[PDB]
């Protein structure tokens, strides 16, 4: 699904995810969040299963964005873990973990959890 | 914390995490899991905050492993989200999401969640 | 939101959630899962914020189901954590953690994570 | 494990968890958090597997605390999902989800995730 994953994706928050999938399983691109302490594009890197099951299963993948670029630094990183599903209604369904740099006293409240669904439209 | 993050790390399960941190915020290396449907080394890629807060806070980071290599393919990917804390007892404290490629009927049970703590010893 | 929460709810999987909210913050009822190692109704108990913010915010709540009843025992428990939002399109948006009883060797893969959205219709 | 679960438990943050396990699978008690927007005791309710596997597996359980009592209301609820393990070093290993009441615009950042381990000592 190198061809299927590569391109521009949009989530339910209006965020924009631009990615190139390599033949080996590399994911590389940029992420632009429509919400939060973020502006403009951030580097993303990740991995995907380059030889997925051919029994109608989705393609497992994940990627990371560290929320530092030339404009801002939110001292945090989000990882998305999920699967790509092809076809007419192609989707990337994910759950994510956003961890912020904290003192040891605030480590217990360092990590947000959510879920994003990405589509080729919107 | 380019110097501090780069090197070999070990978690509570006995897994081995070897990483190089770039000046820009890149993480690159290999992961070897002591448990599960895995054998030998897998490529990992990630991001970290290359200019963290200097108020005693940890350094936010994340990385992904797709569980395909030359030996096995478990049709899944794990992302670790957490923070690096330096000093005598240097640690990377993480929470992770392991997503497997599934049919749409089994998507509800596609994602495991856990937490790993990595140290420079063990 | 004692009145608003009390009643029958349905999620995206077709599962049925029947609950009574007490004036103090108690949640009590039964849960029927449309998927997984489950059949018929299971006891649920939980808590909700009985005096929520009046600034348009949702009402925080949570509940637990242990997957043992007279028909089956799946040796597991799911907790849903989320918020109730009233109005025309009333919803309970949740994230959940399903933990299974495991040996210490399999504890790392003991917990599934997902998200359910419940509505008054369907 | 009705006998084993019932009593006072302490986590790594110094929080105190007092619970009575019923024969049917009920959990009832009070929770006192050593951290966060909390003071004194809060009602908790939950469920556990009252007939667990006898193959050395842990006992699945979960419970909820809504962070409202006579002293404070933090407009949030935490659910802990995990398993009880008996013996000399008896433990309750959990992962938790803390959801706060939010506006729809802030729903994406409504949920914290963490992990607590409870012991009979400390």
From Swiss-Prot, chains A, B, C, D:
<keyword id="KW-0092">Biotin</keyword>
<dbReference type="GO" id="GO:0005576">
    <property type="term" value="C:extracellular region"/>
</dbReference>
<feature type="domain" description="Avidin-like">
    <location>
        <begin position="2"/>
        <end position="122"/>
    </location>
</feature>
<dbReference type="GO" id="GO:0009374">
    <property type="term" value="F:biotin binding"/>
</dbReference>
<feature type="binding site">
    <location>
        <position position="108"/>
    </location>
    <ligand>
        <name>biotin</name>
    </ligand>
</feature>
<feature type="short sequence motif" description="Cell attachment site; atypical">
    <location>
        <begin position="47"/>
        <end position="49"/>
    </location>
</feature>
<keyword id="KW-0732">Signal</keyword>
<feature type="binding site">
    <location>
        <position position="96"/>
    </location>
    <ligand>
        <name>biotin</name>
    </ligand>
</feature>
<keyword id="KW-0964">Secreted</keyword>
<comment type="subunit">
    <text>Homotetramer.</text>
</comment>
<feature type="binding site">
    <location>
        <position position="42"/>
    </location>
    <ligand>
        <name>biotin</name>
    </ligand>
</feature>
<comment type="similarity">
    <text>Belongs to the avidin/streptavidin family.</text>
</comment>
<comment type="function">
    <text>The biological function of streptavidin is not known. Forms a strong non-covalent specific complex with biotin (one molecule of biotin per subunit of streptavidin).</text>
</comment>
<feature type="binding site">
    <location>
        <position position="80"/>
    </location>
    <ligand>
        <name>biotin</name>
    </ligand>
</feature>
<feature type="binding site">
    <location>
        <position position="31"/>
    </location>
    <ligand>
        <name>biotin</name>
    </ligand>
</feature>
<protein>
    <recommendedName>
        <fullName>Streptavidin</fullName>
    </recommendedName>
</protein>
